[PDB]
Write a protein that binds this ligand. Structure first.
Ligand SMILES: Nc1ncnc2c1ncn2[C@@H]1O[C@H](COP(=O)(O)OP(=O)(O)O)[C@@H](O)[C@H]1O
Lengths: 192, 341, 192, 56, 192
């Protein structure tokens, strides 16, 4: 059950859900697996928030085990398209898409909690059918891996070769190690 | 005493108000007519000339009250103002609309002729719209003529035993207000109705002209969507829009106006024998500070005063100083105006 | 689950859904597999928007892996039938039917994000029964194949022969490649 | 504060939580603007007649 | 079915849910298995409470059999980040994850009911795949094990060696025993 909250305003008192109330404060939650339906909801929130104030930062809290690349790229493209900077905060877990979307935030506004875990790896997939079809899908996913690594190297700052070798298999990184790798800029330990 | 032609009224209005060229013409003929009729009771026929009220729809700190005030000063007539948010319907504790008539007569110095030739200025008309309606119903009558009982209190407690009635069908009701949101309503009627999306138009390019050009396309229907009852709009035939003061405007306002802040400080320092200068570099920076904090034209005084406070505290206690050149660093507080004697 | 938002105006405050709030701005979301139920909902949104203002463009954000042909063609015929122009924006993924509905938008209003994938292929089908019945269904799907290709060539501008060879098997296309083929007219990367 | 308050109200460090926590008092009063007085409930004409203000 | 309660104030009568009503009183409920959806909900409540009064204490009721480590750390980091002190009260049972969040409360503000049961053990996990991948996950979980023990020792005041030996297997601690171990400070019996 989602709790309700009251917001006192000039017109009176207004009732909001805990999630909707935080949306008013430019806060978006990225929880669970990344899919098409969930991604479109986040996109709608980003576009909606842009209209009120295109100069105010947007906060995207990331806690997810990963998901499909297509849905994630929709959020990534939206973040770069909108004028306001998107601040990414990692709480709990950040997988391939979570880490990619975590390092895609505005330079200097990528935060992470001290006990958060960040994981990065290469894309997964498969196809069953004729050899000709397998070749088409095999080349498609390969291009995606290269396109993803190129973007990861851009935000993190590491070389393309280093990103390739480090992503050959699952690589777990803590909050301090993430800063060294360039996935985040600072760590939030205590208020102020 | 031939009334001043519209051109004269405009040329003079420019001196004390920079910008708002369209509204200046609107408020020039509107007053030229509102008085050309009052000075000619008859019409060489049986016609009974009516009244045309003015609706000043402009943004905050744009010169709405200033225009109404400076326009009355060109002539010699009373000027009054009010606030729609300080009124309520009958039967409630809230101040009654008739009270506005009281304040008007007081400024008139207990006279009917003057009060009949007065220019009341209601303000903050917005925010009393639908979901308010009751307060707009009472005013709807006063603006289009109504006799009202004026409580006999004031000069010799107003000797007249008939409550000094006054016809409210000759008072120019310049009802202003900053309709926050009308720009969006108009955009959905004159351009793409998409405000959110990849193909919409987000207003983040510091386009201060947008509000001005959008408001110029205002229509009665747009006001209906804003909340204003159809009857009230009909009572206000004339409409004059005001643009948004830009950085260039503020710079001009600091130097061009006859009562410009710069000239004011220059005048007092001249009384002490010291001259005062204002480098153009300093002036533009002051303007940028106002936009940053959104203080508006009203905040200019605070900025310049703060920068000259310390200076004023030392000029009378010093000698041989005869010139000051305010620099860009003086206003921010990182420098002190050089005294070159 | 779905966040709520408020629209502040002179009249007052109105609580709106994130998807409903965007509908006022003539924005329709095509998410998930295409089917009769979701397609009917999209059609209703188009007709309702047409009633409000038949002169304002409608924006359709497409992110789907494809679906039923009949449900998809209902949207196509509805987009061309209504007077307002329908602008299509590809976000993340556009499959066989999603790509057909992407290129079917108004000329000069077909957009695609840079990190997006587009796929096109011949329709799929099947039928179990008598031989004479198989011939009827086999002949019918062939007409759909040719009929769909004729529309793709019209909107894309390519030749029917080129479309036939390209759609013989799955063909993946990126945003820059889609512009060359004519599936879209421009790429949106940053605002202004 | 509301006039000079920028940023969200709810969130992590990025957001400003100083709202309740008393840090400085004279600082805010020193940057007082007539516009603020309007919100407090003072008619514009009255606050416009007093150009000077001395924060204690 | 959650019952509805009434709150009387000099603003108008308002009907609230039993859980939402207690949220206004700085009370947050942590019930059931810990997962990402409920964890993000608790996190949102904490950030909302500190906005109303960042000086007053926040009460967290813990009755859960444990859950995901990542989800729990999200709550732990949020608790230690916010300025107000988080008071933890154990009712029913507190497992590995529940106990970690219990002892993570403010010093001197951790309470436990007389018949409550507490349990602590090492983290669980598992991975199926290549040997090289197993070593990656084997070292990752070990780091978490050490990290959890270090934090447990800090709050409980015990030595890291004692925690490792005691958490090697399931260890059940009653309310009076938890006080000696350091997981809690006092026991609430009657309203004095
Ligand atoms: N064009 C202008 N020229 C000179 N002063 C201006 C101008 N516009 C605004 N001001 C300043 O703004 C103040 C009046 O603001 P006003 O226009 O009454 O605000 P509102 O329209 O919200 O009532 C005056 O003190 C005046 O000096």
């Amino acid at each position: 059950l989602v709790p309700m909250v009251i917001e006192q305003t000039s017109r009176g008192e207004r009732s909001f859900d805990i999630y909707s109330r935080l949306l008013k404060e430019r806060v978006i939650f990225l929880t669970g697996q990344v899919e098409d339906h969930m991604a479109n909801l986040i996109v709608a929130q980003m576009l909606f928030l842009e209209a009120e104030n295109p100069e105010k930062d947007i906060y995207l809290y990331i806690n997810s085990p990963g998901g499909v690349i297509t849905a994630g790229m929709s959020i990534y493209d939206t973040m770069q398209f909108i004028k306001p900077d998107v601040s990414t905060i990692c709480m709990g877990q950040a997988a391939s898409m979570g880490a990619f979307l975590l390092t895609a935030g505005a330079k200097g506004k990528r935060f992470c909690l001290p006990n958060s875990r960040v994981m990065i790896h290469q894309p997964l997939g498969g196809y069953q059918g004729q050899a000709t079809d397998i070749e088409i899908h095999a080349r498609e996913i390969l291009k995606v891996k290269g396109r993803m690594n190129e973007l990861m190297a851009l935000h993190t700052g590491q070389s393309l070769e280093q990103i390739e070798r480090d992503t050959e298999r699952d690589r777990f990184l803590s909050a301090p190690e993430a800063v060294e790798y360039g996935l985040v800029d600072s760590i939030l330990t205590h208020r102020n | 005493s031939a009334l001043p032609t519209p051109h004269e009224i405009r040329n003079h209005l420019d001196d004390y108000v920079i910008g708002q060229e369209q509204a200046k013409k609107v408020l020039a003929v509107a007053v030229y007519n509102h008085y050309k009729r009052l000075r000619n009771g008859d019409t060489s026929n049986g016609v009974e000339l009516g009244k045309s009220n003015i609706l000043l729809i402009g943004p905050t700190g744009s010169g709405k009250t200033l225009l109404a005030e400076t326009l009355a000063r060109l002539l010699d007539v009373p000027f009054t103002m009010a606030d729609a948010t300080t009124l309520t319907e009958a039967g409630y504790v809230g101040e009654d609309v008739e009270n506005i008539i009281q304040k008007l007569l007081q400024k008139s110095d207990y006279d009917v002729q003057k009060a009949q030739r007065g220019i009341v200025y209601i303000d903050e008309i917005d925010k009393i719209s639908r979901k308010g309606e009751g307060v707009q119903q009472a005013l709807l009558k006063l603006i289009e003529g109504t006799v009202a009982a004026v409580p006999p209190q004031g000069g010799r407690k107003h000797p007249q035993q008939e409550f000094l009635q006054v016809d409210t069908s000759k008072i120019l009701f310049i009802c202003g207000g900053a309709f926050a949101g009308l720009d969006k309503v108009i955009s959905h009627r004159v351009e793409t109705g998409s405000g959110i999306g990849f193909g919409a138009t987000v207003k983040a390019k510091s386009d201060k002209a947008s509000e001005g050009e959008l408001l110029a396309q205002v229509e009665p229907e747009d006001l209906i969507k804003f909340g204003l009852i159809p009857e009230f709009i009909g009572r206000l035939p004339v409409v004059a829009t005001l643009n948004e003061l830009s950085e260039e405007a503020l710079i001009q306002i600091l130097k061009e106006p006859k009562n410009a802040l710069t000239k004011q400080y220059q005048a007092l320092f001249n009384l002490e024998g010291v001259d005062l200068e204002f480098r153009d570099e300093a002036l533009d920076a002051i303007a940028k500070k106002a936009m940053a904090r959104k203080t508006g034209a009203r905040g200019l005084r605070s900025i310049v005063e703060a920068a000259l406070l310390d200076t004023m505290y030392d000029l009378p206690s010093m000698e041989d100083v005869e010139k000051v050149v305010i620099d860009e660093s003086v206003i921010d507080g990182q420098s002190e105006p050089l005294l070159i004697y």
